[PDB]
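Re: HZ6 structure - here you go.
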Amino acid sequence: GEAPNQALLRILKETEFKKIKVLGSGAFGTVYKGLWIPEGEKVKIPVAIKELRTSPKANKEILDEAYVMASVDNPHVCRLLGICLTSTVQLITQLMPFGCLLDYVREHKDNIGSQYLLNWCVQIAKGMNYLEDRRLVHRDLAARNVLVKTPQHVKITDFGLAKLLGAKEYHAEGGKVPIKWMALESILHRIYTHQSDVWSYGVTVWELMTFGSKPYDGIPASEISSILEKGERLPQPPICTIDVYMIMVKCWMIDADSRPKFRELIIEFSKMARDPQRYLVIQGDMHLPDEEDMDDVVDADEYLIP
Ligand SMILES: *CCC(=O)N1CC(Oc2nn(C(C)(C)C)c3ncnc(N)c23)C1
């Protein structure tokens, strides 16, 4: 009873990309930055190229993420531009120039205002609510997997763990999971739901309000299941009014259904962003903020080929 996924998978000539530099080779794999110039179009699109870190049927998992990324279209979700089928299979996506939100919140923590924090909360809840519309469970929502296009615009990324549900619960089998972001049911029963992502959304909000603190810092991930059963949660961050912390606490409730819906999280944080200093107490509420031949540079969000 599902609709045909008529998304288009664009195969891109390795010749179309130029000026490729290195952006990082962390746990996400070797990621490059560069310019994608579609032949005979006179546009230069800043892109990120990612190959997993050979030909060891890891080539299989990278196509799984491309499938998901090619099937999403939302201003707060990173969309796949295309894949390059050279010796390595590469994901080509829109370049998010300011990097992950986790490193951004750390490196600019003395210049992030309550307006920015509450707005990021709205945008992530809009992206997640879109992923819920498309019957998609992210299973890896964290501040590290939210990229920053501009300080005013963030998008959810990294769909390696993402899984598409039929027409409610998903049962994983094994492998490295981010324990400190998962709902209790995801830890004990390996059940994942849109409401399991709400728990992850809660930990993601806690990362921002603490300006990039490590959740459950210095405590072995094997202990996490037990202390969460004892009724323990993450602490109230200093800048957080009880209003904002009460929303985070609601995301970590043991009854998965009595947790907030992503559509309800948009509404509450939207109302809060209407008056940010009433809900986030931050000292000094502040402002926030590529090579020469740039005449034909078009950001990917304005390059729309149907
Ligand atoms: C927060 C540190 C970090 O995770 N990263 C910096 C590096 O940048 C980066 N990674 N990707 C993907 C493709 C691996 C998700 C990007 N896509 C787009 N733009 C940037 N800057 C990306 C990841």
